[PDB]
Scaffold this motif. Structure first.
Motif, PDB file in Angstrom:
ATOM      1  N   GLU A 105       2.191  -2.419   0.883  1.00  0.00           N
ATOM      2  CA  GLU A 105       1.659  -3.748   0.622  1.00  0.00           C
ATOM      3  C   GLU A 105       1.942  -4.172  -0.812  1.00  0.00           C
ATOM      4  O   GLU A 105       2.160  -5.341  -1.086  1.00  0.00           O
ATOM      5  CB  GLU A 105       0.175  -3.813   0.940  1.00  0.00           C
ATOM      6  CG  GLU A 105      -0.147  -3.614   2.411  1.00  0.00           C
ATOM      7  CD  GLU A 105      -1.645  -3.642   2.709  1.00  0.00           C
ATOM      8  OE1 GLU A 105      -2.335  -4.666   2.374  1.00  0.00           O
ATOM      9  OE2 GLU A 105      -2.116  -2.653   3.316  1.00  0.00           O
TER      10      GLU A 105
ATOM     11  N   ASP B   5      -2.008   5.140   1.074  1.00  0.00           N
ATOM     12  CA  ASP B   5      -1.723   4.623   2.400  1.00  0.00           C
ATOM     13  C   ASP B   5      -1.158   3.216   2.362  1.00  0.00           C
ATOM     14  O   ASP B   5      -0.297   2.866   3.152  1.00  0.00           O
ATOM     15  CB  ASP B   5      -2.973   4.602   3.241  1.00  0.00           C
ATOM     16  CG  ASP B   5      -3.489   6.025   3.598  1.00  0.00           C
ATOM     17  OD1 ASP B   5      -2.722   7.016   3.503  1.00  0.00           O
ATOM     18  OD2 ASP B   5      -4.695   6.086   4.007  1.00  0.00           O
ATOM     19  N   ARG B   6      -1.582   2.422   1.407  1.00  0.00           N
ATOM     20  CA  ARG B   6      -1.182   1.049   1.396  1.00  0.00           C
ATOM     21  C   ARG B   6      -0.144   0.729   0.358  1.00  0.00           C
ATOM     22  O   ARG B   6      -0.016  -0.437   0.008  1.00  0.00           O
ATOM     23  CB  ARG B   6      -2.418   0.175   1.224  1.00  0.00           C
ATOM     24  CG  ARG B   6      -3.451   0.422   2.303  1.00  0.00           C
ATOM     25  CD  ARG B   6      -4.754  -0.304   2.067  1.00  0.00           C
ATOM     26  NE  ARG B   6      -4.549  -1.727   2.131  1.00  0.00           N
ATOM     27  CZ  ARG B   6      -5.485  -2.643   1.936  1.00  0.00           C
ATOM     28  NH1 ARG B   6      -6.734  -2.303   1.619  1.00  0.00           N
ATOM     29  NH2 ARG B   6      -5.171  -3.936   2.009  1.00  0.00           N
TER      30      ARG B   6
ATOM     31  N   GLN C 143      -6.526   5.426  -0.179  1.00  0.00           N
ATOM     32  CA  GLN C 143      -6.353   4.024   0.134  1.00  0.00           C
ATOM     33  C   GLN C 143      -5.151   3.419  -0.576  1.00  0.00           C
ATOM     34  O   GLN C 143      -4.326   2.734   0.048  1.00  0.00           O
ATOM     35  CB  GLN C 143      -7.558   3.210  -0.300  1.00  0.00           C
ATOM     36  CG  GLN C 143      -8.606   2.885   0.765  1.00  0.00           C
ATOM     37  CD  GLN C 143      -8.129   1.860   1.760  1.00  0.00           C
ATOM     38  OE1 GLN C 143      -8.070   0.623   1.488  1.00  0.00           O
ATOM     39  NE2 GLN C 143      -7.678   2.363   2.892  1.00  0.00           N
TER      40      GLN C 143
END
Lengths: 194, 194, 194, 194, 194, 194, 194, 194, 194, 194
Positions: free
Chosen positions: A62, A58-59, A55
């Motif tokens: 951001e 993947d992010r 997680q």
């Protein structure tokens, strides 16, 4: 350990598995000028851990898009990290990573962040938010069986950025776009009416 | 201080302002058999603090209904608490409260949870999740200018309840109804297919 | 550490990966009555280490047939061990093992055998021969880049067995079938004519 | 004592019986630039000991030819050494020696190599491999009744030389001419598929 | 060390080479009821030492006949002792011995008599006269290059025996048959008229 | 105390009764360049003591003629010494003296030679031989009731002088004119044969 | 030392020269029920000392007739005391004595009365008055060159006796027959008028 | 305390009542070059004390005329002193004084002269004779109910002056005009004939 | 704590609520050259406390007019102070204030004045009078349930000013205009006639 | 010292001058069941002190009538006290007293109440109010030149009695007959309106 809010984050300089598959020393001072989310996990090849690590990987963007890096850390060697990376996610592996992972083989880093579980030799689910001057601003530690929330880490980093930028203070549950207030007895009245 | 995960939460027995406006000793052992969210704030009559306290008060039932109490604490006297309670929310007051608020006048409670800011004499935004056996399971500490998130506290309590009830482990970002997994190399394969 | 010849070997009771793929606590006292070759290696997924581990695993029976067990140990978790076991030898894996492998995650075992390399958090190539009464009788420690010799371990175990059975003493380079001598000024004369 | 791998070998400067029958101080720093095999034995005029000392003396050249010296040491005086040298091998003597023998009368050397048997005042069968920079690279200690193997000492010295010369790593059971590998995840694949 | 006149002689129980060529523990308490001359020498296979040891051995009977035993001691092993015994006197050996010789390998005995030469690890030429109650009555210590006098040791033992038997006191240079005196101001006048 | 062989003799500078009947400070450093026999006795006006003191006084010349002084010492004041000197030998006095007698009224000198008998406040019969460099070379201590032998003191001084002059070593019972030997394994053979 | 007014006089039990020329232990507890004048002097065979000792000896009866003993003490042996006793007064001797003289050879008695002159090893001219319950009531210490006054010691003993007997208090310069007073504000007026 | 004979008298500098009725600091160093009789008493307005104080005051001149001052001291304030001075002798007062009286309100002076009676907070009847170099030469301490003798203090001062002037020594009971002697064995004979 | 009379008052520099409603640091050194009445109270929003605080505020000018400031202090935050100020007196508030109020949130100031009640975390009713040189001259501490008297504080300040101005001393119950006296035995007589 | 509010008053048992002119021990425990005003003064025969002592003595009955005793104390002896009592008030005396006066000669009492002025040996003007359970309830200490007020002591005792009897709390400046209030947020409103 050694980690206190509004003091310099405990310094480290340790071997890490980098996104491109190489081994390189990663030093806390290399993040000077950026926000950093440093997070620990107990053990490679386990259960909650890959869901969290994947997680964050993947992010990453951001976080990078608002000037914040992310760094993972556990007790395992670089070689365990690399091996875990070589297994596909559908078999409980990590696959390719976009974040570095420290190999805290001496356990000195987890000791200094105060997240060693002494009886087992592994790190609790500690997550720390370090600001650009390298001071510690937020501490989060979960017991092993409950994972962390990436959206909440992001909310916090945003809230802390907002506070630096504007000299205002962020209320409970604040999300980007919500009302904030000045920490002053007279000027705060504007927030509390309507 | 001496708050460590999976050890008994540091014991306390201190005067509190109760919801009904009275003063009474509240002891940690009163909560035996329940989950407890214990949370600290720096100072009565300030800014972030009433937004947090009022949110937890308004939403107590979301916590009670699942066997979890909530308790607030600060450095201020019981008389400051009461006075603050007597001012309406729209003027920066608390109004009526549905949770007790401890008055840690000697600061011994915040010292023991490790959330005293020594230079100022106030508590950081520490929040702690204590289980029915009275062991500490989750630690969260924010610097003063950034408020905590009530939805995240709730998520954590639920996740911990879920883990105790079913012997499974809660992945990153878990919300009620999401997939979980057994912490076993073989049985976890089912999760990693999705 | 505190491993001394002719004193009780430092006691341990730690999680291990067993030959059948399970996890179980292995305690030193479970080898009472047997000879034990306890050997440490630095890191899973590396280079010299699998060549040693595989040689001992392939040749366990040479040891078990003469009343001697063999036990491996490193700093890595059980989960790293298991994973390594799941990779084939021709890719640098271990494959199936006939020997248990301890996971010394707290590093307490290696500390006590005196083979921790403090700066790296890993064990040197320490090998120890423990007798049926659980006293330490032979110490061998190599620096990391040079592997140990399994034939020499076997020779030593045999020599120690021979000494316990017959009350003789084993000369330099002794192999089964070579001349030995009684450790007595008069009776030794027989050996020295030659 | 204080002999640790990859630290400087504990320094010594002590009276020895030299090959030519004289007494001279031998200092560790005299061996700078060479490999050294330093080995201890319990007592002059005993049983295993002459078989070991004579083997090393007969075979010194196998060591010298590859830049390695050998040095022996025990608790006994120079005069015991000399006397033992004056008895023929067939009567349990040493005869002429090609290696020096230290007389560690104060026992400070064996103390510092950690091979004193305190109850008896003698050295265990400790053997140490010291490199040209004078760092300790290999430790071997046998209980008294079991002799060491000269061929294995030689194998180790050769292996260590090989590693320093080529930057490769020596597998289990390595002998001159066997395959070695680079200690790198990608370059090690060549070793494992063949 | 802790040898003091008129205090119990420091106790010992140590391996010795006995006159008949065997090894046996000799304990100070074995000599209870007898006078004992205990004497130390630096090193087997040296120069002054055999001349002293052989004199005491040849003349044991002069001591036994008057209820006094003699015991020798050095730092060397039993095996050195035995070997030295196996060389003839005309080659600097001891030959057959009529007195036991302790092997103080740990050096604890010489330490406790205060005759260790710390820098060399050997005993000075200490000689001690211990009475039947096991109290120390006479201390003699020579530097290494000067031998002791057996006739003087005998004189002293005789003098001490004479004093126990008769309650009189032995003047300077006293030999058997010389005048002695009662240690009383009045009765001593008889001695001083002559 | 702190008298040790081959270390500087403990220094002193104390009032003494001189041969000519006067009182003067006598300092150990006054004897630099000479041999010194320093001897202690328990008490003025007693029994063994005058026989020893008078013998050393009568025979000083045997010592002076070979470069050796003699000095006596006891616990008593200089006035006791003087008084004792004023009584004739036939009444248990000293008469005229040819040697100085120290008055160790603080007892610091006997403490430092290790010959204080604490319970009584007097010196044992300690005799010390100090060389021209002021190092201690021979220690003798008798219990109170047995006198020392002047001929033996003289023998020792001579033996030590002989050893300094010729670099040879003095056997058991050596008297001027007896055979000596070089302390060398080879050259000593000439003493041991014939 | 430990001599304090109105505390038990420091206890002693030491060899003394008795009036009849014998040696006997004299213990402080022997004087229980009597007054005691204990006095110290520096050295036998000196100058002030015999004038004091002889005065106290000649006048014992003045003390014994009023229930008071006298005891003398110095650093010298019993044998010095006895000798000094054997010389006539006209030659600086004591002659026959009517008081015992302690021989404080260990100096423990003078230490405890606080009258040791450390640099010299002798007692100052200390005089102490001890009462029948064995408590110390008067301390007098003179430097060496000035003698004490016997008439003043007698005056003090009489004054202290008078005070015990009558509960009155003795003014400055009091002699038997002078006015005394009751230590009471009212009753003392009688003394102060006329 | 720390008053020792032949050491500097413990220094003081304290408020005193002067003869002229004023208050002034009196310092020990003011008496440098003079003899000083320093004397302590327990309490103003008591019984023995005024008889002593008045005697010393009346007879100051006997002391001044020979170069000796006198100084009194007690625990009482200067105001108590003054008041006591204002009452006539016939009602237990002091009247006019010719001697200063220290007010040792902190009790530090009496502590340092070793004459504090700790249980009561008052001084014993200590009298000290200090010489012109400010060294202590005579100590006298009486229990409270027995007064001191002024004639004896005078005798002592005179004796000490006599000794400093002539280098002779003062016998027992010495008064001006009595025989004295030189402290020399030979020259003292003239005293002892008479 | 460390407040002692006639020593410097313990220094402080702490946030205070100023009369004009702002927050500012107030430092003790700001009052150099003035008299200061510093007074502590337990808790904002209580009972005795506002009656005292309001009395001192209403009457500041009685103190300012004579060169004396007044300062209040409690454990509560500056925000509690401000809030309390915002409530009218007839509802238990403070209303507008003419004196600053320190917020001793760390409790360091009350600790140093020795008026912390440790068990509750609040200050006792301590009142201190500090002079223009910043030395402490008067201490008053009441238990919590009894208020202090402002007229008494004023009396004391006046009395202390009077003493500094005139060098006279203020009798019991002194009010401006009453008789005073010089602290001198002679000059005080004028006071005591009346 | 160790006087703390709401702890037991430091215990004492000391000689005092009683009103009838006698000396008697007065113990704190004698006052169990009564209120006590204990007050200290610096020195007998001074200036402020008699004005305070006389005023408490004249007005004892105002205190006795309400169950409160009064006790005075200073550093001076009983005899100073008695003497001061014997002088008329018009000459600076006390005259007849109705209050006992402790004589704290050892100063242990003032030390324990914390009112010793160490440099001078006298007490500051400390006044303490002790309740019937013997706990300390009020502390007052004045510097020496300013006297205390008897009316204020009386006011305080009355206020404390009032509080114990009625459970109400006494406002600033309270005198008998003034309004008081219940220490309760609700019930206190009655006091604050009108």
């Amino acid at each position: 350990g050694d980690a206190k809010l509004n003091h310099p984050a405990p310094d480290f300089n340790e071997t890490a598995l980098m996104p491109n598959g190489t081994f390189k020393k990663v030093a806390l001072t290399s993040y000077k000028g950026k926000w950093l989310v440093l997070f620990f996990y107990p053990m490679d090849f386990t259960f909650v851990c890959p869901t969290e690590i994947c997680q964050f990987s993947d992010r990453v963007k951001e976080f990078s898009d608002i000037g914040c890096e992310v760094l993972a850390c556990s007790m395992d060697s670089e070689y365990s990290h690399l091996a875990w990376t070589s297994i596909e996610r559908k078999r409980g592996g990590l696959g390719q990573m976009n974040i570095p992972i420290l190999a805290d083989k001496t356990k000195c880093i987890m000791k200094s962040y105060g997240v060693l579980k002494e009886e087992d030799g592994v790190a609790y689910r500690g997550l720390f938010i370090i600001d650009p001057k390298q001071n510690l601003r937020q501490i989060t530690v979960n017991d092993l069986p409950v994972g962390r929330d990436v959206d909440e880490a992001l909310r916090l980093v945003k809230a802390f950025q907002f506070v630096e930028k504007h000299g205002e203070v962020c209320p409970a549950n604040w999300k980007p776009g919500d009302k904030t207030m000045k920490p002053d007895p007279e000027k705060s009245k504007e927030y509390f009416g309507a």
